[PDB]
Amino acid sequence: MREVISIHVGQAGVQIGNGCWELYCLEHGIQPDGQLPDAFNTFFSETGAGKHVPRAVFVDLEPTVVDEVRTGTYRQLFHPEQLISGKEDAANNYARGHYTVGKEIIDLTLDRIRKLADQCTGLQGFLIFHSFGGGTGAGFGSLLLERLSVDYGKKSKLEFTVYPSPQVSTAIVEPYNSILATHSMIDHSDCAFMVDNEALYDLCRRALDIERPTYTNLNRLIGQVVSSLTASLRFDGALNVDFTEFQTNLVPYARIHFPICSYAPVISAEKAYHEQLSVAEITNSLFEPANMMVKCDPRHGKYMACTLLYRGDVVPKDVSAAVATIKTKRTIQFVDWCPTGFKMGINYQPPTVVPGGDLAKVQRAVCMLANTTAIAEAWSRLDHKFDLMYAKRAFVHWYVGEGMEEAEFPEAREDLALLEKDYDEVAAES
């Protein structure tokens, strides 16, 4: 009827994917073993009898993360062929994961993703998760997009990645992986969303009521954003928005696809008792500089794209009043090139809460996806970090010895420089 397929690369993608599929099973009323105790065809397939199977494939170059799913409670759901595990990881090396080791398993992975698409008739879309800092996430994602771009042509390829934080970091060679990855996604990706763990920690602490979050809580927040995005394809609504609708609306050009995400309300399960959180309340909360999951300054970032997906008991008039009120604010400056600048999706299905979770039981919620020029601020931070290490040739020997040519560094450097020039040109008035 209409079908979606997901791929998860790296431990960040697999662990995020773990949280997502528990969210869907609770939302769709499917036990972990896969039997019922509708929309199912969008994400799940019926294998005869009374068992279901998810439309997902989990890939990593190390067996630890995949074996965790194999040992966990959710092992009964997944198909053993969907769980593909390598032998040795990329060791945070883009060249190692792109040429030496990624090419060993690339052919096997492409077979399974194409094979599962044969059962998937009404297909338009892919979901891919990346960890930009990790070598496998950036390196394998580049090769995977290169193959999928030519094998399938005009198909909606959407990615959900984790952007490196401006100051928080866990790998010293992270800037090298990000720039080389950015050089390949900028041509092979239709539209990819990014979040940074620094703002995720900040939002989880101020608005949410967690003193010391782990990766599990952060994955749950990401899963709610994904669930809101896919709500239109699964449930009826006054304004349903398709995958192709997002691609047309959000981007004004080819290389400016990168949007930012915002979700409201993000109030905790305890403090939420006091507030009704009407349409005007949640709409105002979205545009707060603190509610962004990307640590970027909205003051420097003009807006020329917005998408307001509401979930729950919502009336379109209240959206019309709320959006009109938002446009009157002087601080939120849209670009001259975007009078309308809005997509709205209203759906009558409320969000879902998970036992042992952290979010509140809100009756209505709204997820926000917008494109702003403030992302060019993060590109300069990554560019300067890359320039400092490459000036004295900090880590050239590792990538060179793994089959990568030396001249590729200036090529990606020039590719990033062109992107920043494009952002300044587009943001400028005329």
């Binding site: 009826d236 008991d313 009336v315 009558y348």
Partner: protein, 49 residues
């Protein structure tokens, strides 16, 4: 022919509070406001007294 109109039953049942129940509160409050407006005339008559 169920699923949409059942959703419409669900959708109008949620609107029911933005519907009817908004009206019961306002016309009841208007009735009480008339009882208030008339003691205004009584109290302004007291101030006239």
């Amino acid at each position: 022919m169920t699923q949409r109109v059942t959703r419409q039953m669900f959708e109008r049942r949620y609107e029911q509070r933005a519907r009817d129940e908004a009206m019961y509160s306002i016309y009841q409050s208007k009735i009480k406001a008339e009882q208030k407006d008339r003691v205004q005339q009584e109290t302004d008559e007291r101030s006239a007294l």
